[PDB]
Amino acid sequence: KNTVVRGLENVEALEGGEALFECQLSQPEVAAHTWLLDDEPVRTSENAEVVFFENGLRHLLLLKNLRPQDSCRVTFLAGDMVTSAFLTVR
């Protein structure tokens, strides 16, 4: 069964500016993941980028040009696991 090997850690960044979250897993997951800001899923956009490496062992979220307004709760979700952290801006 697969587990989080390296949780989201909180991130401090100042508007804007950019922030970057990462998250590693025991087993590789490529299809069932989604990132969330507060509770809204990330919409890929020039201001938000989503990728993974090593065939799904590592997951990354990059958010660009932040406004403190943007301070929130980042969640990564893959199948059933779940890891979270805080994004503080400025």
Curated annotation (Swiss-Prot):
Domain Ig-like: 2-89
PTM annotation, UniProt: Autophosphorylated by protein kinase domains 1 and 2.
Cellular localization per UniProt: Cytoplasm, Myofibril, Sarcomere, M line; Cytoplasm, Myofibril, Sarcomere, Z line; Cell membrane, Sarcolemma; Nucleus
Family per record: Belongs to the protein kinase superfamily. CAMK Ser/Thr protein kinase family.
Quaternary structure and interacting proteins, as annotated: Interacts (via protein kinase domain 2) with CDH2 and (via protein kinase domain 1) with ATP1B1. Isoform 3 interacts with TTN/titin and calmodulin. Isoform 3 interacts with ANK1 isoform Mu17/ank1.5.
Role: Structural component of striated muscles which plays a role in myofibrillogenesis. Probably involved in the assembly of myosin into sarcomeric A bands in striated muscle. Has serine/threonine protein kinase activity and phosphorylates N-cadherin CDH2 and sodium/potassium-transporting ATPase subunit ATP1B1.
Disease: Rhabdomyolysis 1: An autosomal recessive disorder characterized by severe and recurrent rhabdomyolysis, usually with onset in the teenage years. Some of the episodes may be triggered by exercise or heat; others occur spontaneously. Rhabdomyolysis is the rapid breakdown of damaged or injured skeletal myofibres and may require intensive care management. Muscle breakdown results in release of myofibrillar content into the extracellular space and circulation, resulting in hyperCKemia (hyperCK) and myoglobinuria. A chromosomal aberration involving OBSCN has been found in Wilms tumor. Translocation t(1;7)(q42;p15) with PTHB1.
This protein's name: Obscurin
Organismal lineage: Eukaryota, Metazoa, Chordata, Craniata, Vertebrata
Shown part of the complete sequence: 4339 to 4428 of 7968
